[PDB]
Amino acid sequence: MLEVCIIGFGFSAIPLVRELARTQTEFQIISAESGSVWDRLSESGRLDFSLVSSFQTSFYSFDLVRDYEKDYYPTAKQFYEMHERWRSVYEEKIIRDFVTKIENFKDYSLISTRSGKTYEAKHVVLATGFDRLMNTFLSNFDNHVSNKTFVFDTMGDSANLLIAKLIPNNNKIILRTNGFTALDQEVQVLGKPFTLDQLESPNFRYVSSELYDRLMMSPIYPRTVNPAVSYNQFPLIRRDFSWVDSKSSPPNGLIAIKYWPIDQYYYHFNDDLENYISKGYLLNDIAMWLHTGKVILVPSDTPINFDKKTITYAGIERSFHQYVKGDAEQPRLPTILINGETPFEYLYRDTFMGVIPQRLNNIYFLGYTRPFTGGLANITEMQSLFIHKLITQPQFHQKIHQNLSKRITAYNQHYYGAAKPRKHDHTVPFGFYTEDIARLIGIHYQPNECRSVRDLLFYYAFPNNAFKYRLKGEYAVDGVDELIQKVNDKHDHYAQVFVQALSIRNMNSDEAAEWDHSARRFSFNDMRHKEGYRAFLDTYLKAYRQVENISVDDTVVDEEWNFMVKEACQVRDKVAPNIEYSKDEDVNKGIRLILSILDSDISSLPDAQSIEFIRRLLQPKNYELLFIR
């Protein structure tokens, strides 16, 4: 009897196949001849964009240990080339066919295929990815569409990439949405670039819920009255967060788009602009679009005529060329038959850690958990370790499954509370999820085993990337020691985010929200760093057009749009003139202090009262996770 069958091979399955090979566990992969959206984009030459996620979080530990030299954003070309490199390694273990049905029995499954070939396997892993409504827009994208009006009912990363591509053809963009969370993918800390995933210090949740909440939520919840923040200039960007019923913030189910702020885009790409655009580094600064009026927000309930193709806002009856109805994610699951009869019903919350479904025996889901920030790699590497351990170690399989339904209830209580199921429940802060799996497997760090201040920075401030948990123990990867050293040497041992937590420990949430926004350039949606880049924007559009052989007329002037932008930007035209740094000073001084006591013994530190606090990090009081204990 075949020990393991993996269904679907693109990106998510790679780390699991690697571990099954290492332990010589018998496995077969079944995967469609057709392949993925990445094959659609490759075949049709549309891998001309870049990831919304850092290198560190988007490539597996066993690639990073070889190829990491600096933080950067990989291109769609590089990401796909990496999938193709791993497909080549394992292609001999792949049967090219399409699974149509799985019949699940007490200790095996019967797998049916389009060819008619059937397979028996004791353990079955689904790594088939999602169907996405929006893929047709990216895969069949037309760049000749010019001077047209688009209406989007949802802001997501796909809409934002479409918008980046339309705007340089003088396409006008109306968003008719119930708000959206957008975050600068890259941020300056005392004049040095940090990808946003470098600054989450997630294990601070263990100090307390409230402290972590103040560390994280002021750029997402409308907490500052600072008029430089996009959610004050353009309030139609605010969301209804009344659904959230959890002390764990950011909450599971919160989705964000991650975008190039124009200032960081300029710092990286200004010197070789056309060549960088052609590699797929597209400016996608939604806040700059709102600032310049190349995008407008309108209320959710703004009347539209689907028959005449018209949207009803202020004075002009604007005909729209296309309505984009907004991306949904549905797992590509075959029919699964419980005891080979009863259709399995998929719901993210009714699986443990997005991986283990109830009422199925030895079936695992790999790649259906979505990270709030950073790449999928962080999530699928840790899920792969979890699945490998369940498959190959019956003691671990028994430990997890014995109280499976209780673990799931305890997880849902902790992370969702009494909220009803939502379509985005599958979205998790990457640094909670990786840490959660690491504690389940037993490859976690213990805060009580920190000796030096340097050790506290590593435990609390070093990002909870999957490779963090592959330094030593059961899943160690060779070269992780050198990788961690390199990353620490380039990021000042994450002293800056450690000092952020030290700065806000005594504040309430309004105070921390004010302090967050006291910076000369605060992390996210700082509308003071837009006007100075108006000339560079024109250079950019000219560069984009030249790269893509586009010719449009700005000497042709769209009068009617010029007119609707004024109505859209009334709060901004009122709020912006009220503009005009505690955070910069606090952080600068704190980093000085921390970097001076790097190698000081914690336990022995003498009796401001930040010392008390630093000493208490050996004994955090919010460490309990009832779905693990």
Ligand X SMILES: Cc1cc2nc3c(=O)[nH]c(=O)nc-3n(C[C@H](O)[C@H](O)[C@H](O)COP(=O)(O)OP(=O)(O)OC[C@H]3O[C@@H](n4cnc5c(N)ncnc54)[C@H](O)[C@@H]3O)c2cc1C
Ligand Y SMILES: N[C@@H](Cc1c[nH]c2ccccc12)C(=O)O
CA angle 412, 468, 426 (to 5 degrees): 25
Q: Is 332 labelled as part of a ligand binding site?
A: yes
* DSSP E strand stretches across 127-275: 130-132, 149-152, 172-176, 182-184, 186-188, 193-195, 257-259
Q: Is 140 labelled as part of a ligand binding site?
A: no
Whole-angstrom distance, CA of residue 232 vs CA of residue 236 = 9
User: Of 74-82, 162-170, 196-204, 360-368, which part binds ligand Y (CB under 6 A)?
Assistant: 196-204
Question: By CB under 6 A, is residue 31 in contact with ligand X?
Answer: yes
Residue 523 binding result from ligand X, ligand Y, none, given CB thresholds of 5 to 8 Å by partner type: ligand Y
Question: By CB under 6 A, is residue 11 in contact with ligand X?
Answer: yes
Q: Are strands 342-343 and 351-352 parallel, antiparallel or unpaired?
A: unpaired
* Residues 260-299, mask of contacts with ligand X (x by CB under 6 A): ----------------------------------------
User: Of 51-59, 263-271, 401-409, 490-498, which part binds ligand X (CB under 6 A)?
Assistant: 51-59
Question: By CB under 6 A, is residue 17 in contact with ligand X?
Answer: no
Q: Is 35 labelled as part of a ligand binding site?
A: yes
Binds ligand X (CB under 6 A): choice among 4, 51, 173, 295 = 51
CB of 213 to ligand Y, least distance (A): 10
| Residue in the shown chain whose Cβ atom is closest to ligand Y | 523
Instruction: Restricting to residues 57-96, name those near ligand X by CB under 6 A.
Output: 58
Whole-angstrom distance, CA of residue 94 vs CA of residue 429 = 32
- Listed in sequence order, the residues at least 6 apart from 393 whose beta carbon sits closer than 8 Å to its beta carbon are none
Q: Phi/psi of residue 164, each to 5°?
A: -55, -30
Question: By CB under 6 A, is residue 10 in contact with ligand Y?
Answer: no
CB of 79 to ligand X, least distance (A): 7
Among residues 446, 444, 455, 501, the alpha carbon closest in space to that of 602 is found at: 455
Whole-angstrom distance, CA of residue 515 vs CA of residue 586 = 10
Beta bridge partners of 259: 184
Of 230 and 362, nearer to ligand Y (C-beta) is: 230
Residue 551 has a CB neighbour count (10 Å cut-off) of: 8
Question: By CB under 6 A, is residue 52 in contact with ligand Y?
Answer: yes
* Residues 318-347, mask of contacts with ligand Y (x by CB under 6 A): ---------x--------------------
Residue 582 has a CB neighbour count (10 Å cut-off) of: 13
Of 35 and 479, nearer to ligand X (C-beta) is: 35
Write the secondary structure of 95-143 as one string of H (helix), E (strand) and C (coil).
Answer: EECCEEEEEECCCCEEEEECCCCEEEEEEEEECCCEEECCHHHHHCCCC
DSSP letter at 270? G
Of 127 and 311, nearer to ligand Y (C-beta) is: 127
Q: Is 155 labelled as part of a ligand binding site?
A: yes
Are 400 and 390 in contact by the 8 Å Cβ rule? The answer is yes
Of 386 and 522, nearer to ligand X (C-beta) is: 386
Of 52 and 64, nearer to ligand Y (C-beta) is: 52
Question: By CB under 6 A, is residue 7 in contact with ligand X?
Answer: yes
CB of 175 to ligand X, least distance (A): 19
Whole-angstrom distance, CA of residue 103 vs CA of residue 105 = 7
User: Of 9-17, 19-27, 516-524, 577-585, which part binds ligand X (CB under 6 A)?
Assistant: 9-17
Q: Is 548 labelled as part of a ligand binding site?
A: no
Whole-angstrom distance, CA of residue 616 vs CA of residue 47 = 49
Question: By CB under 6 A, is residue 156 in contact with ligand Y?
Answer: yes
Of 127 and 453, nearer to ligand X (C-beta) is: 127
Binds ligand Y (CB under 6 A): choice among 251, 367, 375, 447 = 375
Question: By CB under 6 A, is residue 53 in contact with ligand Y?
Answer: yes
* DSSP E strand stretches across 349-438: 351-352, 356-357, 363-365, 370-371, 427-428
Whole-angstrom distance, CA of residue 104 vs CA of residue 504 = 52
Whole-angstrom distance, CA of residue 241 vs CA of residue 223 = 13
CB of 381 to ligand Y, least distance (A): 13
**Amino acid at site 267:** Y
Under DSSP, is residue 573 helix (H, G, I), strand (E, B) or coil? helix
CB of 329 to ligand Y, least distance (A): 7
User: Of 22-30, 108-116, 370-378, 416-424, which part binds ligand Y (CB under 6 A)?
Assistant: 370-378
User: Of 10-18, 238-246, 265-273, 424-432, which part binds ligand X (CB under 6 A)?
Assistant: 10-18
Whole-angstrom distance, CA of residue 373 vs CA of residue 379 = 11
Of 97 and 157, nearer to ligand Y (C-beta) is: 157
- Listed in sequence order, the residues at least 6 apart from 217 whose beta carbon sits closer than 8 Å to its beta carbon are 223, 249, 250, 509
Binds ligand X (CB under 6 A): choice among 16, 36, 203, 445 = 36
Residue 431 binding result from ligand Y, ligand X, none, given CB thresholds of 5 to 8 Å by partner type: none
Binds ligand X (CB under 6 A): choice among 4, 17, 37, 257 = 37
**Which residues contact ligand X (rule: CB under 6 A)?**
7-13, 30-32, 34-38, 51-53, 58, 98-99, 127-129, 132, 138, 332, 334, 367, 375-376
Q: Pick out the residues of the known binding site for FAD.
A: 11-12, 35, 38, 52-53, 99, 132, 332, 376
